[PDB]
C-alpha cells in the first residue's frame, strides 16, 4: 500500500444543537443591470458609492457589515448585474442566506433577473422581491409579480412565500418595509453558527496589494478568526497577519457571518474557495502538499490518455514500416530500404514555424481574481477560430510587469489591463519591445477593444460590384508581331466596360475565366471606357481561353471592405 496518505483538511461536521449560537444573516442584492441594486444598498449603507464608479457599473462583489437601527447587523453582498459577471453572482448565492431580488418596475424581468432566480434555486435560499423604480411612469408592480410566476417566483398576493415590497431607492420611499421584511425572514430562518472552534469561511475576493501583499476578502461561517490563525484555502495557506474591515480599520475578531479582509497568504486563493483553520504552519503545508499532489494525479491521468494516443499512433507507423518487409536480418532491411532510400528525398520543415497573421495572443492582467475569471470566461465564448485564433499566453492579477511585457514580446501578444496600472518604466519598455499595453476600466470597453484587434487580423473582404456586361459575337484572329492574337468581338448590352476594372468570362451561366484584358481596342483605336451599345474587341492575357459565338462577359469592380469579427460576446 505505497499510496500517499490523505492529509487533507475537511469541513467540520455540522455543529451540535447545543453549540449553535444565533448569528447575523447574510444577504445578497441580485438583479439586472441598472435596476438599482447599488442605489438600494447605498440607502441602507448610508453612503453613496454609485456616483463614484467608472461608468456607474458594479464590477465587484463587496460584503458590507451594515448595522440596522434595531441593533441587528446584516452583511450585504452587492453583486454585479452585467452579463459578464455570471460567476460572481453564483458565488454570492452560495454564501448568502437571503437573496434580495431587485426587479425594476419600469423594465420588469430581464435576462439576468431569471439568472439570479436560478442561482437562488440551486442554492435553495429564500428570495425577497424588491420592486424598485416604482416612482417612474410605467412602473407596474403587479405586472412584475405576474411575470415572476412563470419563473417559479410566487408572490404572497398570488399565494406564494416570496415577499414583494414596492420601493423607490432614489427617493428612499418604502425602504423601511424592505428592511423590516429582511429582518423578519432572517428570524424565521433561525440562523445559528457555533462561534468557537476551527474557523470556516469562504473567499469572496482575492487580490494583490503592493504594501499589504496577498489579500483575500472572506466571510466567516463557523468559529472566530484571530491574528495568528493558520488558514488553508485550496492550494494556498496563510497565517493571519492583519484583519481589516471595508474601511481598512483593524478588527481583532471576525465572528460568524462577518466580512473580513485577511492578509498573510503565502499564495493567492481562488475566489469562492472554502477556508479552513489548521493547528500549525507545518500542518498547513502538509495539507497544501496533499492538495497539490491530488491535482497532479488528476492532470497526470488526463495526460496519460493523450500520451497513450500519441504513442499508439507512432507504434502503428513503426510496425507498418517494419512489416513492409519480412522479419529478415536488419542488414537486409536497410539494404532493401536502401533501394527505396535511393528513391527518397524528404525536406525537413523548420523547427520554428511562423505564426500566421490571423493569430491574436493576449495577456490578461486584472485588479482582482474574480475580474480576471470574468474576462477568461468571455475568451472561452470565442467561436470564430476559423477566421482568426485567440491565444491566451498568460493571465494574472496585479499591475503590468516586465514578465508580461517579455511574454508579450515573445509571442507578439497584446497586454490587456483591467483596472490596473502600468508605470513609465513598464510603458517605456513596451515601446522598445513593440508591445501594446491596453489598460481599460470597464468590461464592455475591454471587450470592444478585443474585438477591434481581432477584426484587424481578419482578412480584407473584397466586395465585387458588377460594372458592365457584354456578349461576344464574332471571334477574330489578328496577326501583330508575328503572334496570332484571338480577339473577341463583343457588344455591350447593360452597363459599361473599363480597362482597369477586372473581368470574368461567362459560358451559359458557368464562370470560365477571371482576369483583366490584355488589350482593349475599338475600331482600331484604344478606348479605356466603352459605353452601352459600343462595339469592342476583347483579347485576354490567357491564350488557353476559347471564345465561342455566345459567350458572356461580366465586368466588375473589386473593393476591399473592412471585415468585422463574427464573434459576439452576448452583450
Amino acid at each position: 500500500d505505497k499510496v500517499r496518505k490523505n492529509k487533507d483538511a475537511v469541513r467540520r461536521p455540522q455543529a451540535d444543537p447545543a453549540l449553535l449560537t444565533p448569528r447575523s444573516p447574510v444577504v445578497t442584492i441580485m438583479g439586472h443591470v441598472d435596476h438599482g441594486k447599488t442605489t438600494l444598498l447605498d440607502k441602507f449603507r448610508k453612503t453613496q458609492v454609485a456616483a463614484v464608479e467608472t461608468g456607474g457599473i458594479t464590477q465587484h462583489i463587496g460584503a458590507f457589515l451594515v448595522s440596522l437601527p434595531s441593533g441587528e447587523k446584516i452583511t450585504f453582498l452587492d453583486t454585479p448585474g452585467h452579463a459578464a459577471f455570471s460567476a460572481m453572482r453564483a458565488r454570492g448565492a452560495q454564501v448568502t442566506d437571503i437573496v434580495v431580488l431587485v426587479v425594476a418596475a419600469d423594465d420588469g424581468v430581464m435576462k439576468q433577473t431569471v439568472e439570479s432566480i436560478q442561482h437562488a434555486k440551486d442554492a435553495q435560499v429564500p428570495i425577497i422581491l424588491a420592486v424598485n423604480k416604482c416612482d417612474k411612469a410605467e412602473a407596474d408592480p403587479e405586472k412584475v409579480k405576474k411575470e415572476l410566476l412563470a419563473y417559479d417566483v410566487v408572490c404572497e398576493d398570488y399565494g406564494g412565500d416570496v415577499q414583494a415590497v414596492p420601493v423607490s431607492a432614489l427617493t428612499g420611499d418604502n425602504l423601511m418595509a424592505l428592511a423590516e421584511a429582511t429582518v423578519a425572514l432572517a428570524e424565521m430562518l433561525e440562523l445559528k453558527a457555533d462561534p468557537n472552534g476551527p474557523v470556516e469561511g469562504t473567499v469572496i475576493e482575492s487580490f494583490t496589494d503592493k504594501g499589504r501583499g496577498l489579500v483575500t476578502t472572506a466571510i466567516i461561517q463557523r468559529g472566530t478568526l484571530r491574528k495568528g490563525s493558520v488558514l488553508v484555502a485550496g492550494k494556498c495557506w496563510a497565517k493571519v497577519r492583519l484583519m481589516f474591515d471595508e474601511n481598512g480599520k483593524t478588527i481583532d475578531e471576525a465572528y460568524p457571518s462577518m466580512p473580513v479582509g485577511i492578509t498573510g497568504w503565502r499564495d493567492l486563493p481562488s475566489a469562492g474557495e472554502e477556508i479552513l483553520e489548521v493547528e500549525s504552519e507545518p500542518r498547513a503545508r502538509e495539507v497544501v502538499d496533499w492538495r497539490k499532489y491530488e491535482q497532479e494525479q488528476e492532470k497526470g491521468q488526463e495526460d496519460l490518455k493523450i500520451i497513450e494516443e500519441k504513442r499508439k499512433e507512432h507504434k502503428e507507423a513503426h510496425q507498418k514500416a517494419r512489416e513492409k518487409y519480412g522479419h529478415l536480418l536488419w542488414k537486409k532491411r536497410s539494404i532493401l530500404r536502401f533501394l527505396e532510400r535511393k528513391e527518397q528525398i524528404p525536406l525537413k520543415p523548420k523547427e520554428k514555424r511562423e505564426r500566421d497573421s490571423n493569430v491574436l495572443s493576449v495577456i490578461i492582467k486584472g485588479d482582482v481574481d474574480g475580474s480576471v475569471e470574468a474576462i477568461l470566461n468571455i475568451i472561452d465564448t470565442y467561436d470564430a477560430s476559423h477566421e482568426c485564433e485567440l491565444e491566451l499566453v498568460h493571465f494574472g492579477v496585479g499591475d503590468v510587469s516586465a514578465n508580461d511585457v517579455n511574454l508579450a514580446e515573445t509571442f507578439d501578444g497584446v497586454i490587456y489591463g483591467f483596472n490596473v496600472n502600468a508605470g513609465n518604466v513598464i510603458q517605456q519598455s513596451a515601446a522598445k519591445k513593440g508591445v501594446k499595453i491596453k489598460l481599460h476600466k470597464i468590461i464592455y470597453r475591454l471587450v470592444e477593444d478585443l474585438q477591434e484587434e481581432l477584426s484587424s487580423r481578419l482578412p480584407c473582404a473584397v466586395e465585387e460590384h458588377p460594372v458592365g456586361e457584354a456578349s461576344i459575337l464574332a471571334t477574330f484572329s489578328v496577326t501583330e508581331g508575328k503572334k496570332k492574337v484571338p480577339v473577341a468581338g463583343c457588344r455591350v448590352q447593360k452597363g459599361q466596360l473599363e480597362k482597369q476594372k477586372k473581368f470574368k468570362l461567362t459560358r451559359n451561366g458557368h464562370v470560365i475565366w477571371k482576369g483583366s484584358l490584355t488589350s482593349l481596342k475599338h475600331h482600331k483605336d484604344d478606348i479605356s471606357i466603352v459605353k452601352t451599345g459600343m462595339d469592342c474587341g476583347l483579347s485576354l492575357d490567357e491564350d488557353n481561353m476559347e471564345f465561342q459565338v455566345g459567350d458572356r462577359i461580366v465586368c466588375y469592380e473589386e473593393k476591399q471592405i473592412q471585415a468585422k469579427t463574427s464573434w459576439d460576446p452576448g452583450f
Binding site: 495526460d303 493523450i306 500520451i307 523547427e351 520554428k352 491565444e391
Partner: protein, 69 residues
C-alpha cells in the same frame, strides 16, 4: 541523434528568463508540453543531440512527472 544512434528525441525551444532562446531536451517517455507553458531547465548535455545542452526538469511548473508504465 547523430550516428550511430537512431531515434526521435523529443525536444522543445524555450525562451529563458535571460532572453535567450535555446533548444531543450525533454526526458522521459511521453510529454504534454505546449506553447506558452512554463518550464524549469537544468544543465546536462544530450550526448547524441549536437548542440542540445539544456534539459527540462520533469515535475516542475507545467512539466509533470512521467506517468508510470
Amino acid at each position: 541523434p547523430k550516428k550511430p544512434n537512431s531515434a526521435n528525441r523529443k525536444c522543445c525551444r524555450v525562451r529563458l528568463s535571460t532572453g535567450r532562446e535555446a533548444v531543450c531536451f525533454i526526458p522521459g517517455e511521453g510529454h504534454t508540453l505546449q506553447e506558452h507553458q512554463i518550464v524549469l531547465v537544468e544543465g546536462g548535455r544530450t550526448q547524441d543531440l549536437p548542440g542540445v545542452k539544456l534539459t527540462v526538469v520533469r515535475g516542475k511548473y507545467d512539466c509533470g512527472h512521467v506517468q508510470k508504465k
